Amino acid sequence: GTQGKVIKCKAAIAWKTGSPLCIEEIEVSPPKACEVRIQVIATCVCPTDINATDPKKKALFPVVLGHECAGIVESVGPGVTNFKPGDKVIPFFAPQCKRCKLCLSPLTNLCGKLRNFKYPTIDQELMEDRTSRFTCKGRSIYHFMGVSSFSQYTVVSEANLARVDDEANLERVCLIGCGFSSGYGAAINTAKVTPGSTCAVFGLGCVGLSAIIGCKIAGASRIIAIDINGEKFPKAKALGATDCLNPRELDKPVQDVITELTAGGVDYSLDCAGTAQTLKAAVDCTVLGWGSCTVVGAKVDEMTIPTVDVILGRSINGTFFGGWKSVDSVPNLVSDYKNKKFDLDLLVTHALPFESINDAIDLMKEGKSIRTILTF
Amino acid sequence: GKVIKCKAAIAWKTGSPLCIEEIEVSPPKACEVRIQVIATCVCPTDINATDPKKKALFPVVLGHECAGIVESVGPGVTNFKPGDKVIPFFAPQCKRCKLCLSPLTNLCGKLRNFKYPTIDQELMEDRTSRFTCKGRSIYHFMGVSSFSQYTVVSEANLARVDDEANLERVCLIGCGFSSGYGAAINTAKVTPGSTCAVFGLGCVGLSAIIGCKIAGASRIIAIDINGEKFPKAKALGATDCLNPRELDKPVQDVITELTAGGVDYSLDCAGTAQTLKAAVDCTVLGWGSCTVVGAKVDEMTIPTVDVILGRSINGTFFGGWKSVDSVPNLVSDYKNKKFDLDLLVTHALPFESINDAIDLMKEGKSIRTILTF
Ligand SMILES: NC(=O)C1=CN([C@@H]2O[C@H](COP(=O)(O)OP(=O)(O)OC[C@H]3O[C@@H](n4cnc5c(N)ncnc54)[C@H](O)[C@@H]3O)[C@@H](O)[C@H]2O)C=CC1
Ligand SMILES: NC(=O)C1=CN([C@@H]2O[C@H](COP(=O)(O)OP(=O)(O)OC[C@H]3O[C@@H](n4cnc5c(N)ncnc54)[C@H](O)[C@@H]3O)[C@@H](O)[C@H]2O)C=CC1
Ligand SMILES: O=CNC1CCCCC1
Ligand SMILES: O=CNC1CCCCC1
Ligand SMILES: [Zn+2]
Ligand SMILES: [Zn+2]
Ligand SMILES: [Zn+2]
Ligand SMILES: [Zn+2]
């Protein structure tokens, strides 16, 4: 684990699609220029990781999945000075090189670092110099979304991580790595929820729940939580939801129930589920004139919206990592948590050994968990 | 309260052109004004009403883009008097509802059908018509019905304008110009130094180009499959012109390459499945904004990834202008030469030759044909 030397450690590898992850012993090369090798302390399983193991979806194999985590810097490549061994950090799929047009713009959190703009899931599958830091059984392993946290040690670009509070609880702040930040920021930054406004959140998993926390912090007077899984309602309400609706138990489309309940629709809707149903419902349930729909989750490649709807005032946009300038914002979210601005503990339903990663996956696929904290 | 006998164009049924008929225009009741139409244009929306594939009501007095003068006002009306120059419009501002009070929209509670606005405001406020022809009551069209020497509109559908206004040009403010102009300024919210793309170069797209220029855009790309529309687009500010028919690559890729990433704002003033798709594709990632103005199809398919990567989509209704309050100002701006509406008028024809104005429009030979009496 010493600097400059290759590290051998446990990691979950997906040798191919539609298969369960395999606990292997891999070789993690040392960081090259502008890279940082991190000791992953805690990591969660995000549906996007599972999505990668879906035969119906495009992906690269073999690969070290995982991208939501927190850890400690083990070593930094040549020329790196903003990071040093011992620092607590949180990597993320959304880079912020701070040295490009996109990074300079206050209108986006995208970065010129990103290359693929049609399949973000298969981008950042290798380091800058198009090579991998991972090796297992003489084979080269693909990185995932610039993070690959399903390994006790991973190497990431400097543009893909932030140093956080020295006293940050790595087993909770790891949620800031993707899930929490994405939903929280979708409400605050992308949808731009305003005080006294009404909101609708579709999908009550970690993202949807964080979106609710965000709407609450933003001052929404009413937050309608929608999910086909009634179990998700208690946690939703505990986080600020004022109304809960299960499309499965309604005789009318859920968007028409929301419209009636609010006498015209909500000011802001956030789809944190992403199905054909939710995407359409998320747009329909907003008020005409100024209704705003924000796409957060997306299980489908397209959404179809009537021309008359946009003409009559409905707007549609979407988020990428909650609209946060990652490097600058992540440290702030960690501080907000330290100051108890929101409670990340309510997002953790399970905590298993890394070896039990496949069980963490099943729990999620089965919708029996929000987030499962995996530790090595 | 005299009943006026005049000529007007009536659409008796779908699939048939308008007919010049002698009609009886009843006097204005409460909160109403009887206008003497001085100049009116045919808008593609007027033409669509007679298209079998489109929802519409019959019989009907079509038209909604015009300018005229007050012939007589209804009981209690004080904001209008005979002789005042006025401009009616489909976007009402009754100033008696919740929507009118809201600074986040220019919609109005007077509107009732939000799925088919073209068949809305088909009758006055008291659900009765002011038009009669051969013992038959005729529907009004979008609260205006300008294809008549005289028409009656709700007070919420008109505004008094500058006494020295050239009704022969300011009539464009009744719909086409206001919508395109406002789409750029109010809806897309074009910013100084920005790059824009305008699809469809008819009266709306051209006005959108004018809007983009006034808003300070530094680059305005004009796209149309009809190259004959470019000269005027350039005359109004277009910096680049692209004809999809003459490009081997999809026009959106050409726009993206020509701008190294796309434009900041796109405005679709054509409305086909292709332009709507191109309008979104050609915007930059991160903050690209597509504003739907024209719409020939009921739906638009947006890739989920586009929105996630920063592109946004919205639409305009009468250019987002609070009609009653804004219309008078647009007239003043023209008076002050803030922009020149004369360029939008390509032809002039006697009202009775309305069907010829319609044919010109369908041949793509015109922007706006003024119909006079
Ligand atoms: N845009 C961005 O930057 C990000 C997007 N995401 C995406 O957001 C989504 C949500 O993430 P998680 O909360 O972690 O996932 P999750 O699987 O825990 O959440 C899905 C929830 O939506 C519900 N649902 C499914 N179909 C539904 C329907 N028809 N109507 C209502 N509810 C329905 C489920 O019952 C479940 O509670 C995922 O699709 C994920 O890939 C995650 C991070 C960032
Ligand atoms: N949202 C709102 O409140 C309003 C919407 N409109 C609508 O806006 C649209 C435009 O109105 P006008 O300028 O008066 O109509 P128009 O018929 O004169 O304009 C259409 C123009 O687009 C071009 N075009 C057609 N297919 C094209 C393609 N694939 N690519 C590029 N250009 C293409 C045509 O050659 C033509 O020059 C109409 O659909 C109209 O109903 C008009 C007023 C207000
Ligand atoms: O879950 C993490 N990341 C993904 C979510 C879908 C859009 C791109 C980023
Ligand atoms: O062209 C004039 N008006 C259009 C405005 C958008 C709705 C259909 C009517
Ligand atoms: Zn994720
Ligand atoms: Zn950057
Ligand atoms: Zn019109
Ligand atoms: Zn009103």
Short mmCIF file of C-alpha atoms in Angstrom, two decimals, chain B:
data_model
loop_
_atom_site.label_atom_id
_atom_site.label_comp_id
_atom_site.label_asym_id
_atom_site.label_seq_id
_atom_site.Cartn_x
_atom_site.Cartn_y
_atom_site.Cartn_z
CA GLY B 1 -76.35 50.22 -30.69
CA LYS B 2 -76.95 50.00 -34.43
CA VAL B 3 -76.59 46.68 -36.25
CA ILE B 4 -73.99 47.08 -39.00
CA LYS B 5 -74.29 45.38 -42.37
CA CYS B 6 -70.92 44.67 -43.92
CA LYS B 7 -68.96 42.06 -45.81
CA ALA B 8 -66.83 39.42 -44.13
CA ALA B 9 -65.15 36.12 -44.94
CA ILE B 10 -66.98 33.11 -43.56
CA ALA B 11 -65.80 29.51 -43.38
CA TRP B 12 -68.99 27.46 -43.63
CA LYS B 13 -67.24 24.11 -43.25
CA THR B 14 -63.88 22.34 -43.35
CA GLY B 15 -62.29 21.52 -46.68
CA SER B 16 -63.66 24.67 -48.29
CA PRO B 17 -62.14 28.15 -48.72
CA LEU B 18 -63.54 31.31 -47.14
CA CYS B 19 -66.56 32.98 -48.74
CA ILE B 20 -67.11 36.72 -48.90
CA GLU B 21 -70.60 37.22 -47.47
CA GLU B 22 -72.77 40.10 -46.32
CA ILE B 23 -73.16 39.71 -42.57
CA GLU B 24 -74.85 41.54 -39.71
CA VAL B 25 -72.51 42.63 -36.92
CA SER B 26 -74.46 43.31 -33.74
CA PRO B 27 -73.48 46.26 -31.51
CA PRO B 28 -71.02 45.83 -28.62
CA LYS B 29 -72.48 44.86 -25.24
CA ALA B 30 -70.85 45.38 -21.84
CA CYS B 31 -67.05 45.13 -21.77
CA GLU B 32 -66.94 44.97 -25.58
CA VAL B 33 -65.80 47.13 -28.49
CA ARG B 34 -66.89 47.08 -32.12
CA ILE B 35 -63.83 47.64 -34.28
CA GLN B 36 -63.68 48.77 -37.89
CA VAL B 37 -60.95 46.62 -39.40
CA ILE B 38 -58.62 48.76 -41.52
CA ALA B 39 -55.92 46.19 -42.29
CA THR B 40 -55.76 42.46 -41.62
CA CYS B 41 -53.36 39.69 -42.58
CA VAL B 42 -53.83 35.99 -43.10
CA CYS B 43 -51.88 33.92 -40.59
CA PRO B 44 -51.16 30.22 -41.12
CA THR B 45 -53.38 29.61 -38.07
CA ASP B 46 -56.33 31.06 -40.02
CA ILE B 47 -55.60 28.68 -42.90
CA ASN B 48 -55.37 25.63 -40.61
CA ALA B 49 -58.94 26.11 -39.39
CA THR B 50 -60.25 24.82 -42.73
CA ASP B 51 -57.89 21.84 -42.80
CA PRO B 52 -59.91 18.61 -42.17
CA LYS B 53 -57.04 17.21 -40.11
CA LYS B 54 -57.39 20.12 -37.68
CA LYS B 55 -60.03 20.70 -35.01
CA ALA B 56 -62.21 23.73 -35.72
CA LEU B 57 -65.74 25.13 -35.37
CA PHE B 58 -68.14 26.07 -38.17
CA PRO B 59 -69.49 28.27 -39.48
CA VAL B 60 -66.85 30.81 -38.48
CA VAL B 61 -65.50 34.27 -39.23
CA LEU B 62 -61.74 33.62 -39.28
CA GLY B 63 -58.81 36.00 -38.92
CA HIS B 64 -57.15 37.42 -35.83
CA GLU B 65 -54.18 39.53 -36.98
CA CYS B 66 -55.28 43.11 -37.67
CA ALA B 67 -55.45 46.75 -36.67
CA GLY B 68 -58.39 49.12 -36.90
CA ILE B 69 -60.25 51.91 -35.16
CA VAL B 70 -63.08 52.02 -32.64
CA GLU B 71 -66.45 52.27 -34.34
CA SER B 72 -68.41 52.17 -31.08
CA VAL B 73 -67.90 50.95 -27.51
CA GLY B 74 -70.23 48.97 -25.28
CA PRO B 75 -72.02 50.08 -22.07
CA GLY B 76 -69.65 51.15 -19.32
CA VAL B 77 -66.66 51.18 -21.65
CA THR B 78 -64.51 54.22 -20.91
CA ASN B 79 -61.05 53.07 -22.00
CA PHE B 80 -62.21 53.22 -25.62
CA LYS B 81 -64.07 55.74 -27.80
CA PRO B 82 -64.97 55.96 -31.52
CA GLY B 83 -61.90 56.89 -33.55
CA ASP B 84 -59.24 55.40 -31.29
CA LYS B 85 -56.72 53.25 -33.10
CA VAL B 86 -56.71 49.74 -31.64
CA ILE B 87 -55.13 46.31 -32.09
CA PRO B 88 -57.02 43.18 -31.01
CA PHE B 89 -55.28 39.86 -30.27
CA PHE B 90 -55.92 36.23 -29.36
CA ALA B 91 -53.99 36.45 -26.07
CA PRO B 92 -56.35 38.12 -23.60
CA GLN B 93 -55.56 40.06 -20.43
CA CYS B 94 -58.93 40.55 -18.75
CA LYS B 95 -57.14 41.88 -15.67
CA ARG B 96 -59.91 40.22 -13.66
CA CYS B 97 -58.29 36.85 -12.96
CA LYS B 98 -55.40 35.23 -11.10
CA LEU B 99 -53.24 34.61 -14.18
CA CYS B 100 -53.32 38.26 -15.23
CA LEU B 101 -52.03 39.29 -11.80
CA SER B 102 -49.16 36.80 -12.09
CA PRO B 103 -45.79 38.13 -13.32
CA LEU B 104 -44.73 34.60 -14.32
CA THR B 105 -47.16 34.22 -17.23
CA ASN B 106 -49.10 36.12 -19.88
CA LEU B 107 -51.87 33.52 -19.92
CA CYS B 108 -55.36 34.64 -18.92
CA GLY B 109 -58.23 32.96 -17.10
CA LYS B 110 -60.49 33.99 -19.97
CA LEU B 111 -58.92 31.07 -21.86
CA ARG B 112 -60.64 27.74 -21.24
CA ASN B 113 -59.42 25.15 -23.74
CA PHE B 114 -55.75 24.45 -23.07
CA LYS B 115 -55.52 21.55 -25.50
CA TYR B 116 -57.01 23.30 -28.55
CA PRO B 117 -56.75 27.09 -28.16
CA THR B 118 -57.67 27.56 -31.84
CA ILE B 119 -61.28 26.57 -31.06
CA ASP B 120 -61.42 28.63 -27.86
CA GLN B 121 -62.94 32.11 -27.47
CA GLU B 122 -65.35 30.97 -30.18
CA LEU B 123 -68.07 33.14 -28.63
CA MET B 124 -68.22 36.33 -26.57
CA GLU B 125 -68.11 36.42 -22.77
CA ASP B 126 -71.85 35.80 -22.42
CA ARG B 127 -71.52 32.76 -24.70
CA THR B 128 -73.28 34.49 -27.61
CA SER B 129 -72.18 35.57 -31.09
CA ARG B 130 -72.28 39.05 -32.61
CA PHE B 131 -72.20 37.62 -36.13
CA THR B 132 -75.23 36.65 -38.19
CA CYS B 133 -75.46 35.67 -41.85
CA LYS B 134 -78.57 34.47 -43.66
CA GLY B 135 -80.44 33.75 -40.44
CA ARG B 136 -77.47 31.83 -39.05
CA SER B 137 -75.27 32.59 -36.06
CA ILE B 138 -71.54 32.42 -36.86
CA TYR B 139 -68.69 31.51 -34.49
CA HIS B 140 -66.01 34.06 -33.63
CA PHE B 141 -62.36 33.05 -34.04
CA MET B 142 -59.88 33.19 -31.18
CA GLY B 143 -61.56 36.26 -29.68
CA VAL B 144 -60.85 38.40 -32.76
CA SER B 145 -62.51 37.46 -36.10
CA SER B 146 -60.70 40.07 -38.19
CA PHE B 147 -61.88 38.88 -41.61
CA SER B 148 -64.79 41.32 -41.57
CA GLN B 149 -65.17 45.04 -42.19
CA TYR B 150 -66.42 45.26 -38.61
CA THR B 151 -65.96 42.93 -35.66
CA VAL B 152 -66.74 42.85 -31.94
CA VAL B 153 -64.11 41.84 -29.41
CA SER B 154 -64.02 41.52 -25.64
CA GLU B 155 -62.26 44.42 -23.92
CA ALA B 156 -59.72 41.82 -22.78
CA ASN B 157 -58.71 41.21 -26.41
CA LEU B 158 -57.65 44.69 -27.59
CA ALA B 159 -55.56 47.73 -26.69
CA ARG B 160 -55.59 51.37 -27.79
CA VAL B 161 -52.44 52.37 -29.64
CA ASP B 162 -50.67 55.54 -30.86
CA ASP B 163 -53.01 57.91 -32.73
CA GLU B 164 -50.44 58.29 -35.50
CA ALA B 165 -50.03 54.54 -35.98
CA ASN B 166 -49.93 53.23 -39.54
CA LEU B 167 -52.68 50.59 -39.24
CA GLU B 168 -51.34 49.22 -42.53
CA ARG B 169 -48.20 47.96 -40.73
CA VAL B 170 -49.00 47.89 -37.00
CA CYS B 171 -51.60 45.19 -37.71
CA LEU B 172 -48.66 42.75 -37.68
CA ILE B 173 -48.44 43.42 -33.93
CA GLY B 174 -51.80 41.66 -33.74
CA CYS B 175 -50.01 38.30 -33.88
CA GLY B 176 -47.06 37.43 -36.10
CA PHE B 177 -44.59 40.11 -35.09
CA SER B 178 -45.44 40.23 -31.39
CA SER B 179 -45.16 36.46 -31.14
CA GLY B 180 -41.78 36.11 -32.83
CA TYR B 181 -40.36 39.30 -31.35
CA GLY B 182 -41.51 38.45 -27.84
CA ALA B 183 -40.45 34.81 -28.20
CA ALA B 184 -36.83 35.94 -28.45
CA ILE B 185 -37.04 38.69 -25.83
CA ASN B 186 -39.53 37.31 -23.30
CA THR B 187 -39.53 33.54 -23.70
CA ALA B 188 -36.05 32.53 -24.83
CA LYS B 189 -34.75 35.55 -22.90
CA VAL B 190 -31.93 36.07 -25.40
CA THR B 191 -28.92 37.74 -23.77
CA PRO B 192 -26.36 40.26 -25.13
CA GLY B 193 -23.46 38.68 -27.00
CA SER B 194 -25.31 35.37 -27.29
CA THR B 195 -25.58 33.11 -30.34
CA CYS B 196 -29.02 32.23 -31.69
CA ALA B 197 -30.59 29.92 -34.25
CA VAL B 198 -33.99 30.68 -35.77
CA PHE B 199 -35.86 27.94 -37.70
CA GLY B 200 -38.52 29.03 -40.17
CA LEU B 201 -38.25 32.46 -41.76
CA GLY B 202 -41.84 33.54 -42.17
CA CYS B 203 -43.23 36.57 -40.35
CA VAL B 204 -42.71 34.88 -36.97
CA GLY B 205 -39.13 33.70 -37.54
CA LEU B 206 -38.18 37.06 -39.05
CA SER B 207 -39.64 38.87 -36.05
CA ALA B 208 -37.73 36.45 -33.81
CA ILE B 209 -34.58 37.49 -35.67
CA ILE B 210 -35.53 41.13 -35.00
CA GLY B 211 -36.07 40.17 -31.37
CA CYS B 212 -32.69 38.44 -31.13
CA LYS B 213 -30.98 41.49 -32.65
CA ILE B 214 -32.72 43.90 -30.27
CA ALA B 215 -31.82 41.64 -27.34
CA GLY B 216 -28.19 42.01 -28.39
CA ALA B 217 -27.36 38.62 -29.91
CA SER B 218 -23.95 38.74 -31.57
CA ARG B 219 -24.74 35.94 -34.03
CA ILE B 220 -28.09 34.99 -35.57
CA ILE B 221 -28.31 31.86 -37.75
CA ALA B 222 -31.34 31.74 -40.06
CA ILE B 223 -32.53 28.34 -41.28
CA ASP B 224 -35.17 27.66 -43.91
CA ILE B 225 -35.74 25.14 -46.71
CA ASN B 226 -36.86 28.08 -48.84
CA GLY B 227 -33.79 30.03 -49.89
CA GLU B 228 -36.00 32.87 -51.13
CA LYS B 229 -36.51 33.79 -47.47
CA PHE B 230 -32.84 34.54 -46.79
CA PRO B 231 -32.53 38.06 -48.31
CA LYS B 232 -35.06 39.46 -45.83
CA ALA B 233 -33.63 37.40 -42.96
CA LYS B 234 -30.25 39.03 -43.63
CA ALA B 235 -31.88 42.46 -44.00
CA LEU B 236 -33.24 41.99 -40.47
CA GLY B 237 -30.04 40.86 -38.76
CA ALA B 238 -29.29 37.25 -39.70
CA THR B 239 -25.52 36.73 -39.76
CA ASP B 240 -25.64 33.24 -41.27
CA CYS B 241 -28.15 31.45 -43.51
CA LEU B 242 -28.56 27.68 -43.88
CA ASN B 243 -30.80 25.69 -46.20
CA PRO B 244 -31.23 22.10 -44.95
CA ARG B 245 -32.03 21.11 -48.55
CA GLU B 246 -28.54 22.15 -49.62
CA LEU B 247 -26.60 20.52 -46.79
CA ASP B 248 -25.35 16.93 -46.97
CA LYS B 249 -25.36 16.79 -43.18
CA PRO B 250 -28.36 17.32 -40.88
CA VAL B 251 -28.67 21.08 -40.43
CA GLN B 252 -28.13 20.77 -36.65
CA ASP B 253 -24.70 19.24 -37.17
CA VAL B 254 -23.77 22.06 -39.53
CA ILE B 255 -24.90 24.62 -36.93
CA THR B 256 -22.94 22.79 -34.22
CA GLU B 257 -19.78 22.71 -36.37
CA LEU B 258 -20.15 26.32 -37.52
CA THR B 259 -20.38 27.43 -33.88
CA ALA B 260 -18.03 24.80 -32.41
CA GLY B 261 -20.60 23.36 -30.02
CA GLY B 262 -23.95 24.89 -30.87
CA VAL B 263 -25.93 28.05 -30.16
CA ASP B 264 -27.05 29.50 -26.84
CA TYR B 265 -30.65 29.99 -27.97
CA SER B 266 -32.68 28.31 -30.70
CA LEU B 267 -36.21 29.39 -31.63
CA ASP B 268 -38.31 27.04 -33.74
CA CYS B 269 -40.65 29.17 -35.83
CA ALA B 270 -41.37 26.34 -38.30
CA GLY B 271 -42.61 23.54 -36.05
CA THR B 272 -42.07 20.29 -37.93
CA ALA B 273 -40.85 17.14 -36.21
CA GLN B 274 -37.53 17.80 -37.95
CA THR B 275 -37.06 21.46 -36.98
CA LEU B 276 -38.17 20.75 -33.40
CA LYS B 277 -35.55 18.01 -33.28
CA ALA B 278 -32.93 20.20 -34.94
CA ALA B 279 -33.83 23.17 -32.71
CA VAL B 280 -32.83 21.14 -29.62
CA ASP B 281 -29.81 19.36 -31.15
CA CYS B 282 -28.15 22.57 -32.33
CA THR B 283 -27.98 24.20 -28.88
CA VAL B 284 -24.86 24.03 -26.73
CA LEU B 285 -24.65 21.52 -23.91
CA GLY B 286 -24.74 22.87 -20.37
CA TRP B 287 -27.18 25.73 -20.99
CA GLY B 288 -28.57 25.42 -24.53
CA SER B 289 -32.13 26.76 -24.65
CA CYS B 290 -34.76 25.76 -27.21
CA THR B 291 -37.94 27.83 -27.46
CA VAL B 292 -40.91 26.36 -29.33
CA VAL B 293 -42.82 29.03 -31.27
CA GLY B 294 -44.27 27.27 -34.29
CA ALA B 295 -45.85 23.82 -34.07
CA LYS B 296 -47.16 21.74 -36.98
CA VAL B 297 -47.21 18.57 -34.91
CA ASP B 298 -48.79 17.81 -31.54
CA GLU B 299 -45.73 16.24 -29.94
CA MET B 300 -41.97 16.55 -29.73
CA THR B 301 -39.55 13.84 -28.66
CA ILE B 302 -36.68 14.97 -26.45
CA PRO B 303 -33.83 12.57 -25.62
CA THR B 304 -33.51 12.19 -21.84
CA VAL B 305 -29.75 12.65 -22.10
CA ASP B 306 -30.09 16.11 -23.69
CA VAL B 307 -31.98 17.53 -20.75
CA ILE B 308 -29.62 15.84 -18.26
CA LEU B 309 -26.68 17.42 -20.08
CA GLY B 310 -27.99 20.97 -19.71
CA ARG B 311 -30.39 21.64 -22.57
CA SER B 312 -33.74 23.18 -21.64
CA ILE B 313 -37.02 23.46 -23.55
CA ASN B 314 -39.85 25.98 -23.29
CA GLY B 315 -42.51 27.55 -25.49
CA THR B 316 -44.15 30.90 -26.18
CA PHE B 317 -47.74 32.12 -26.30
CA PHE B 318 -48.11 35.46 -28.09
CA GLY B 319 -44.42 36.10 -27.48
CA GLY B 320 -45.02 36.13 -23.73
CA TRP B 321 -46.40 39.67 -23.82
CA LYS B 322 -49.01 40.88 -21.36
CA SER B 323 -51.09 41.80 -24.42
CA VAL B 324 -53.12 44.81 -23.25
CA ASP B 325 -50.14 46.38 -21.47
CA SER B 326 -47.48 45.43 -24.03
CA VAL B 327 -49.14 46.02 -27.41
CA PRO B 328 -49.27 49.81 -26.99
CA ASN B 329 -45.52 49.78 -26.26
CA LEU B 330 -44.63 47.76 -29.35
CA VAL B 331 -46.45 50.36 -31.46
CA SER B 332 -44.43 53.13 -29.81
CA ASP B 333 -41.18 51.27 -30.51
CA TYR B 334 -42.09 51.07 -34.18
CA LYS B 335 -42.95 54.76 -34.15
CA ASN B 336 -39.51 55.37 -32.68
CA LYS B 337 -37.99 53.12 -35.34
CA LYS B 338 -36.77 50.54 -32.82
CA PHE B 339 -37.55 48.10 -35.62
CA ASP B 340 -39.18 48.26 -39.06
CA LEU B 341 -42.37 46.32 -39.71
CA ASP B 342 -42.50 47.41 -43.35
CA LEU B 343 -40.08 44.62 -44.22
CA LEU B 344 -42.59 42.02 -43.03
CA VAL B 345 -45.26 43.13 -45.51
CA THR B 346 -44.55 41.59 -48.90
CA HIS B 347 -47.92 42.09 -50.59
CA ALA B 348 -51.19 44.02 -50.40
CA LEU B 349 -54.60 42.93 -51.68
CA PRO B 350 -58.21 44.11 -51.46
CA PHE B 351 -60.08 42.20 -48.73
CA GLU B 352 -62.26 40.47 -51.34
CA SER B 353 -59.11 38.85 -52.73
CA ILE B 354 -58.47 37.10 -49.42
CA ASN B 355 -58.32 33.67 -51.06
CA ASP B 356 -55.50 34.94 -53.27
CA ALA B 357 -53.59 36.05 -50.17
CA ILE B 358 -54.09 32.54 -48.80
CA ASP B 359 -52.74 30.91 -51.98
CA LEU B 360 -49.64 33.15 -51.88
CA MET B 361 -48.94 32.03 -48.34
CA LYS B 362 -49.24 28.35 -49.26
CA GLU B 363 -46.90 28.81 -52.22
CA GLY B 364 -44.38 30.18 -49.75
CA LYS B 365 -44.31 33.36 -51.82
CA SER B 366 -45.09 35.72 -48.95
CA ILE B 367 -44.34 36.80 -45.42
CA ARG B 368 -47.48 38.85 -44.79
CA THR B 369 -50.14 40.07 -47.21
CA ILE B 370 -52.06 43.06 -45.90
CA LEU B 371 -55.78 42.96 -46.71
CA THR B 372 -57.38 46.40 -46.99
CA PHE B 373 -60.87 47.80 -47.45
#
